[PDB]
Amino acid sequence: GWASETAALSETATPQIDRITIPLHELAAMPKASQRLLDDSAFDIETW
Amino acid sequence: ALNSAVAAEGGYLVDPQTSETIRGVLRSTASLRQIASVVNVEATSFDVLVDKTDMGSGWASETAALSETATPQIDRITIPLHELAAMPKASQRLLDDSAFDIETWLANRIADKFARAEAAAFISGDGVDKPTGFLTKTKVANGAWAWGSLGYVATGAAGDFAAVNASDAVVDLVYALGAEYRANASFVMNSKTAGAVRKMKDADGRFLWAEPARLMGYPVLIAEDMPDIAANAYAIAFGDFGNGYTIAERPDLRVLRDPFSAKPHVLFYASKRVGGDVSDFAAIKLLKFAA
Amino acid sequence: GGYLVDPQTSETIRGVLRSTASLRQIASVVNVEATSFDVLVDKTDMGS
């Protein structure tokens, strides 16, 4: 603030630091493919 | 564009020209420093060494077996060299926007106050944290004069000078001082004592005493810190302060500006340190008004 | 200290700005060192 010609000029204020956390979770998927329908199938399911 | 008197019709184009230097009341400077013994000393104290006595001469015979003669005993006097400090507070917004030189004026106005505050200590100051003036030196009647004391001559009447033979207490004070100290000696009075001296007039109304304002031919230092003519006061002193009084000082003024204590101000802290008391007690006589 | 401040004073005295368009930059300006100027025109034309 404007100090003015005469004043004590006390301590004003300081930005209060706040911390935001990005917990970094994981994204998972487990397609359960049978073994039969994996080698007797003409389509490559393991790459599909 | 018209007359410079009325404001709107061209009166705003004037700008009063201010002073060159910021003047001030010209206060007393007769400080006894210019007549006493000022010695630069960068220490905690000054220790003078005097010879309170003298030797003995023989006038030896042709066959006399010369004996040992006297030898002057020696006195040491310690000038404590106290300090004098003043701390004026000037705003920082002022110092910036103040076309004069406020710092140089503050140091020049302080050095005027110090040269004036130490003039009181050299005359009537006591011993605590300040030089002892020659008035606090156990004044003893003259004739019964010892070394550790200042002599004085009495006037007669208590309130003022003698009732009948006035102006004899002044002349015998002169000739009670020693022909070698009177060579360069001077009275010390205040403004209202030197006035009461000039008002002294003979039996016909004419002044009996005939810019430096000397008295009986000897100079007069018009102090402002000696006592005036009271019931039992020492209003007039006279002596060779060139040898009687010694001043010890550091010939500078240490100013420490402090922008930190008072934050929007600067708070100049200046302090020179000076001390001094009488070193030759035989060289200062006094005029007590008691009896 | 409030007596010895002496504000600055805007080295040149300014004024409100007025328009400079004066019809001189479209009209005909004739330097005439006389009591008056004449012009000679042809209010009509010839015949054929």
Enumerate neighbours of C (3 or more CB pairs within 8 A).
Answer: B
B282 with B181: CB under 8 angstroms? yes
In chain B, what residues touch C4 (CB-CB under 8 Å)? 18, 22, 98-100, 102
Residue A47: strand, helix, or coil: coil
The verdict on B97 touching C (C-beta cutoff 8 Å) is yes
First to last CA, chain B: 78
The verdict on B37 touching C (C-beta cutoff 8 Å) is no
- Nearest residue of chain C to residue B20 (CA atoms): C4
Report the C-alpha dihedral over residues A33, A39, A43, A45, rounded to 10 degrees. Answer: 30
B4 with B13: CB under 8 angstroms? yes
What is d(CA B50, CA B63) in angstroms, rounded to the nearest whole number? 35
Place of tokens 């240490």: B254
B84 with B274: CB under 8 angstroms? yes
Say which residues have a Cβ less than 8 Å from residue A15's Cβ, sequence separation at least 6: none
CA distance A3 to chain B (A): 8
What is d(CA B236, CA B227) in angstroms, rounded to the nearest whole number? 8
> A5–B93: do the CB atoms touch at under 8 Å?
yes
Strands B74-79 and B186-189: unpaired
What are the structure tokens assigned to B154, written together? 């009495």
The verdict on C5 touching B (C-beta cutoff 8 Å) is yes
What is d(CA B280, CA B111) in angstroms, rounded to the nearest whole number? 29
Task: Classify the C-alpha dihedral C36-C42-C44-C46 as positive or negative.
Answer: positive
Q: Tell me how long chain C is.
A: 48
What is d(CA B233, CA B159) in angstroms, rounded to the nearest whole number? 9
* Secondary structure (DSSP) of C1-48: -TTS------SS----------STTTS------SS-------SS----
What is d(CA B44, CA B275) in angstroms, rounded to the nearest whole number? 10
Chain-centroid distance of CA B116 in Å reads: 9
Kindly list the distances between the CA atom of residue B240 and the CA atoms of B68, B188, B222, in Å, as whole numbers in the listed order. Answer: 33, 11, 15
What is d(CA B149, CA B140) in angstroms, rounded to the nearest whole number? 6
What is d(CA B206, CA B201) in angstroms, rounded to the nearest whole number? 5
Enumerate neighbours of A (3 or more CB pairs within 8 A).
Answer: B
In chain B, what residues touch A6 (CB-CB under 8 Å)? 91, 264
**Per-residue 3-state assignment (H helix, E strand, C coil) for chain B:** CCCCCCHHHHHCCCCCCCCCCCCCCCCCCCCCCCCCEEEECCCCCEEEEEECCCCCCCCCCCCCCCCCCCCCCEEEEEECCEEEEECCCCEHHHHHCCCCCHHHHHHHHHHHHHHHHHHHHCCCCCCCCCCCCCCCCCCEECCCCCCCCCEEEECCCCCCCCCCCCCHHHHHHHCCCCCCCHHHCEEEECHHHHHHHHCCECCCCCECCCCCCCECCECEEECCCCCCCCCCCEEEEEECHHHHEEEEECCCCEEEECCCCCCCECCEEEEEEEECCECCHHHEEEEECCC
Task: Classify the C-alpha dihedral B55-B56-B57-B63 as positive or negative.
Answer: negative
What is d(CA B217, CA B223) in angstroms, rounded to the nearest whole number? 18
What is d(CA B281, CA B188) in angstroms, rounded to the nearest whole number? 16
Q: What are phi and psi of B46, to 5 degrees?
A: -120, 125
Beta-ladder partners of B222: B189
Kindly list the distances between the CA atom of residue A35 and the CA atoms of A19, A30, A43, A45, in Å, as whole numbers in the listed order. Answer: 49, 15, 14, 11
B36 with B48: CB under 8 angstroms? no
Residue type, A10: S
The verdict on B1 touching C (C-beta cutoff 8 Å) is no
What is d(CA B208, CA B180) in angstroms, rounded to the nearest whole number? 27
What is d(CA B183, CA B177) in angstroms, rounded to the nearest whole number? 10
Structure-determination technique: cryo-EM
Strands B220-222 and B186-189: parallel
User: What distance separates the 2 farthest-apart alpha carbons in chain B?
Assistant: 110
Kindly list the distances between the CA atom of residue B181 and the CA atoms of A37, B5, B28, B137, B240, in Å, as whole numbers in the listed order. Answer: 134, 67, 27, 19, 5
Enumerate neighbours of B (3 or more CB pairs within 8 A).
Answer: A, C
B234 with B227: CB under 8 angstroms? yes
What is d(CA B274, CA B249) in angstroms, rounded to the nearest whole number? 4
In chain C, what residues touch B22 (CB-CB under 8 Å)? 4
B228 with B195: CB under 8 angstroms? no
The verdict on C11 touching B (C-beta cutoff 8 Å) is no
> B91–C9: do the CB atoms touch at under 8 Å?
no
CA distance B223 to chain A (A): 40
Mutation target vs C (from B19, B100, B106; most C CBs, 10 A cutoff) = B100
Selection from C1, C6, C12 nearest residue B16 by Cα: C6
CB atoms within 10 A of CB B87: 14
The verdict on B102 touching C (C-beta cutoff 8 Å) is yes
- Nearest residue of chain B to residue C10 (CA atoms): B13
